[PDB]
Amino acid sequence: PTINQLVRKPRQSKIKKSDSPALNKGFNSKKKKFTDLNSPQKRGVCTRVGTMTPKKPNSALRKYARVRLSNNIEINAYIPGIGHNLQEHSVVLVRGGRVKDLPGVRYHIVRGALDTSGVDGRRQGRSLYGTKKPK
Amino acid sequence: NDRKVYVGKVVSDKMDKTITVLVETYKTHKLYGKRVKYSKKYKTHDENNSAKLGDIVKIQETRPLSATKRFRLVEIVEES
Amino acid sequence: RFRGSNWKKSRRLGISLSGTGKELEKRPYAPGQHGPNQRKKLSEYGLQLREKQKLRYLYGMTERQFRNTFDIAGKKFGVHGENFMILLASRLDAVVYSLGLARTRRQARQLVNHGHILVDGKRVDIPSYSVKPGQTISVREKSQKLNIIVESVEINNFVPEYLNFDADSLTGTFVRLPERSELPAEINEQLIVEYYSR
Amino acid sequence: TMTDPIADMLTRVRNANMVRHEKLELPASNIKKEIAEILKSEGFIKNVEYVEDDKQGVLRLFLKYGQNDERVITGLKRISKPGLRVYAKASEMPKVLNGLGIALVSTSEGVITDKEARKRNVGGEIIAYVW
Amino acid sequence: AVKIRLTRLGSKRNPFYRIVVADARSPRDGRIIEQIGTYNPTSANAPEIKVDEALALKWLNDGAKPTDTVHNILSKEGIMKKFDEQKKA
Amino acid sequence: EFEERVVTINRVAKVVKGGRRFRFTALVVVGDKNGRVGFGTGKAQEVPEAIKKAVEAAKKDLVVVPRVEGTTPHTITGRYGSGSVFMKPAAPGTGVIAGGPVRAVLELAGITDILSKSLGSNTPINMVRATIDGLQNLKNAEDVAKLRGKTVEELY
RNA sequence: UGCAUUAGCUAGUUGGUAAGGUAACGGCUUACCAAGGCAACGAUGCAUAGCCGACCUGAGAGGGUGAUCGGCCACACUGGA
RNA sequence: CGGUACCUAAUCAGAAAGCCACGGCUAACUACGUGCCAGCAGCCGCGGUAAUACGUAGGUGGCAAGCGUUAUCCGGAAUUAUUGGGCGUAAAGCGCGCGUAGGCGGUUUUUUAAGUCUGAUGUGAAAGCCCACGGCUCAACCGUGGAGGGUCAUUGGAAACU
């Protein structure tokens, strides 16, 4: 554009959309609103735990968990690891991060935070998947 | 000390001793650096309905004489 | 700090110089289970890394002390690739090692740790004191005679240039800042500086 | 209804330089005459000529070329322009092409070169870059 | 009332005091009128009083009151002794 | 004597009715660290023979790089199609900072201290030619005064 | 600061002449007289946000933030006095 | 604060390392287990019987009282481009006119000083940023002296360009 129609209509930027849009909304219960405070984690109670199959050339069945968080919104959340302890009504700490080759789930679960316990036998990549030092 | 000494151009002589001059100057733009004219209607206090529409008027600021006029007349450089 | 074997680090890098040589026993390529093999050739980011490690494990530092003493070499008028060399040998680890009070660098660093120096006056027991040009480095009067101290002076000669040394209570002087000639040029400083440019 | 005269001057010079022309003519001015007078003093053109006609007398330029068929002016850029006039103080008055090319600048003494504006300690509207 | 005070700077277990003519209702480390000089108790041997005495007497002649420690600072140099000769003349 | 340096090898196959093809090509940069640098490409199947095909192809086109010492003479931008490098002179103790393919065409002439940034496109064929075309259009201070008619001190 | 997918806002509102009253000028308030005032240079309306020194980032241009430390303003369960 | 900082002696190699990566970006790999399962994944993508990408074990490496993940911000991003981008076919020329406001406007002389340039002040507190010393056993930090206020306003001048 020329210099006059760029003074008269300035350079508006291109907005950046944040992934994990459920972790950056709070819920004031005394006013029933949605605040914005950019939380790194947010805990929640679980609703359904089943298995979901990938849609890629991959072929498996992945363990997800439908969790409603501190704010009253529903997500789907993946469980990393081997074994879990996630029947229903358990309190788990939702970690951000998308898992691809799975539709409609883009969050993890911190393995070992509130009520989920760590994996049964890892000793290699041990800090994530959350188990303590053996012996 | 001394007070500000602006010059302008009348816009609407309404009734009862008030004229409004139009001081026009050139603010520059922040980012692109292009000069651009802008206006500022300064209400001012005519003594006895002297100046008419079309005149260029030198003015000076004073104490607040009403709710919106803060300036007074000193001298008329040209008229119509 | 490191506390490990300088033999293995001298295998992967050039030399750590515990004795006069350390790589002649095993394969001088790499330590474990892939050393005696075909050495796959190495890219530019690797070789900008290896010469940085050959200088870091020489003086026995760690990063954000190796990095925080890098950008404060970007303050003087000289060449930044060798300002980082000259103020790295002006510590109380190299100066105790250069004017020989030890048979190696680690017990020289252990000598300045426990308080056997009393440099220019009372005491500096830190191993990262950058020595200004022109103040003396001694041994503590409480411990002037040890098996470690005296019996490593007589073996290692060649107190390097821009230094002094004596037998009257072992008093070096640190005349001025040493040159790139009077500094070990086995590791080239001309490629470490591009690692911290990224 | 051409709207920038001395940019139309400056692209007549560039287009004649591209086809190895050695002689072109301008509808002239004072600032067109005295920019064209300052290129021969710095040594980009051979010789400028007279102003003669009844209305807006023309002048001819006589471009100058290297002995191996090279050209002297390699690149020619108008910097100040209508809509966005650029002005320079004498402190940040910029060197063209690491001091190689020049920058004719209209200051309050008549227009002068890049060299002749810092030691005079005057700034003004910076007209163009010649290199 | 304006009064010459001590605004403390410096770190924990290392006090450093700049001396300041300021109003009595401002906070301690807050807004000032003019900063006369410094004071340092925790140096080698001295207190290291720096006072531009030509300017400290501009405030003592129109209402500034030293408060019990800068009155020792000004007496250590000798401003308060020389303050009488304006009143005596 | 010339100093060989590769940029990248490429693994290119053209589709055939039967078995597809095994052409491995490579571009190299050839210079002498004194002000004379050329590039070239080479297509073969034997990979060390595919290198030396590109080295001798670089030998037919060497461009003389003018130089005020330890840096480049002035500020230029090279252009060839979509690739466009930037080239600012620097102090003689800065170190040459450059990208992947443009570092090899800048180290092989002796500069070792310039600012640079490869604007525009990304493919290593174009930016090594949009750097040579930049280094083609550099001018010394002494030879401009030959054309302009002044002396070296009259230009300043 | 963001919206024109907010284009008509004002009616003590804009002047006047009086009178009161304020530390002080004044549509600050109350009487009459006059119909003005502001606005695409964004009046108004809605939404958001204490502002700045500064801090973080960037080669710069510029972008982001207001914890701590200072300057100023506003508020003190909510709303008047 | 506080019998605290610190200083003298006495004793002992005692008690004082983990953490994530190992396909290619990205310097560090072999072997068993498992065999589109269990699982990994920042990107491209790994696993169907000889997995350097899964799980473990021995190695090695990054650096370390930390390490790694996540969240948010700036940079890389010249992917809002004044510096510093575009519109034949990749996203982008209104279906074309008449015209309001606005923006921009041929040549010369005289002239004024709004823009512009230049030099006299005044001010943009302190703290910090940059630079130089001083005090911390070094460093963090702290203190003092300087770039310096370059934004602006007041005051002389210059007259080419708007």
Mutate to test the interface with F, among C48, C79, C189, C196 (most CBs of F within 10 A): C79
Minimum-distance residue to G37 (CA–C1'): B68
Best D100, D113, D130 residue to mutate vs chain F (most F CBs within 10 Å): D100
* Nucleotide in closest CA–C1' contact with C66: H63
Residues in a beta bridge with B71: B44, B61
C-alpha dist (Å) from residue C194 to C47, C48, C197, F112: 11, 7, 5, 12
The backbone region for A29, taken as left when phi is positive above 0, alpha when psi lies in -120 to 50, beta otherwise, is: alpha
Angle in degrees, 0-180, between the axes of helices D31-42 and D5-18, rounded to the nearest 10: 40
CB contact under 8 A, D98 and F73: yes
Measured CA to CA, the distance from residue C158 to residue F42 in angstroms comes to 55
d(C-alpha E8, C-alpha E16), whole Å: 6
Round to whole Å and give the CA distance between E52 and E35.
Answer: 10
Which residues is E37 bridged to in the sheet? E19
Report the candidate in F1, F31, F7 with the shortest Cα–Cα distance to residue F110. Answer: F31
Burial of C155 (0-12, 13-18, 19+ CB in 10 A): exposed
* Chain D hits for F144, Cβ within 8 Å: 100
- Whether D79 and D41 have beta carbons less than 8 Å apart is answered as no
Residues of F in contact with D70 (CB under 8 A): 147
Task: Determine whether the distance from the CB of E25 to the nearest atom of strand G is below 7 Å.
Answer: no
E strand segments, D14-104:
25-26, 59-60, 76-78, 87-88
Residues linked to residue F76 through DSSP beta bridges, in sequence order: F87
Distance from CA of F137 to the nearest CA of D (A): 10
Amino acid symbol at F39: F
d(CA C68, CA C80): 14
Nucleotides of G under 7 A from a protein CB: 3, 13-17, 25-28, 33-41, 61-62, 69-72
State the Cα–Cα distance between residues D54 and D27, nearest whole angstrom: 12
The method recorded for this entry reads cryo-EM
Q: What is the CA radius of gyration of chain F?
A: 18
Are there at least 3 beta-carbon pairs closer than 8 Å between F and C? yes
* Chain A nearest-CA residue for B28: A7
Phi, psi angles (nearest 5°) of residue F30: -125, 125
Residues 6+ apart with CB under 8 A from D122: D90, D107, D108, D109
**How are beta strands F76-77 and F83-89 bridged, if at all?**
antiparallel
Q: Which 3 state secondary structure label does DSSP give F38?
A: strand
**How far is A85 from A89, CA to CA, in rounded Å?**
11
- d(CA F61, CA F84) in angstroms, rounded, equals 21
State how far the alpha carbon of E46 is from the alpha carbons of C129, E40, E76, in Å.
28, 8, 11
Up-side HSE of residue E6: CA atoms within 13 Å toward CB? 18
Q: In angstroms, rounded to a whole number, what is the distance separating the alpha carbons of residues E33 and E13?
A: 27
The closest of F80, F111, F83, F76 to F97, measured between CA atoms, is F111
Q: In 10 A of CB F86, how many CB atoms?
A: 17
- Pairing outcome for strands A107-109 and A91-96: antiparallel
- Give the separation between CA F90 and CA F47, rounded to whole angstroms: 38
**Does an H or E element contain A41, and which?**
strand A41-48
Residue of D nearest to F155 (CA): D100
Distance between CA atoms of D26 and D12, rounded to whole angstroms? 8
What's the 3-state SS for A49-109? CCEECCCCCCCCCEEEEEEEECCCCEEEEECCCCCCCCCCCCEEEEEECCCCCCCCCCEEE
Listed residue (F117, F109, F126) closest to F41, CA to CA: F126
The answer to whether the Cβ–Cβ distance between A3 and B34 falls below 8 Å is: yes
F43-to-C16, C53, C89, F11 alpha-carbon distances in Å: 45, 39, 51, 11
CA of E68 to C1' of H148 (A): 37
Q: Residue F57: name the closest of F44, F79, F69, F42 by CA.
A: F42
What's phi and psi for A5, nearest 5 deg? -80, 5
Rounded CA-CA distance A27/E42 in Å is: 53
Containing D130, the helix (H) or strand (E) segment is strand D128-130
F134, containing H or E segment? helix F124-136
Which CB contacts under 8 angstroms, 24+ apart, belong to C183-190? C183/C85, C183/C86, C183/C89, C184/C58, C186/C14, C186/C15, C186/C54, C187/C14, C187/C51, C187/C54, C187/C55, C187/C58, C188/C51, C189/C55, C189/C81, C189/C82, C189/C84, C189/C85, C190/C81
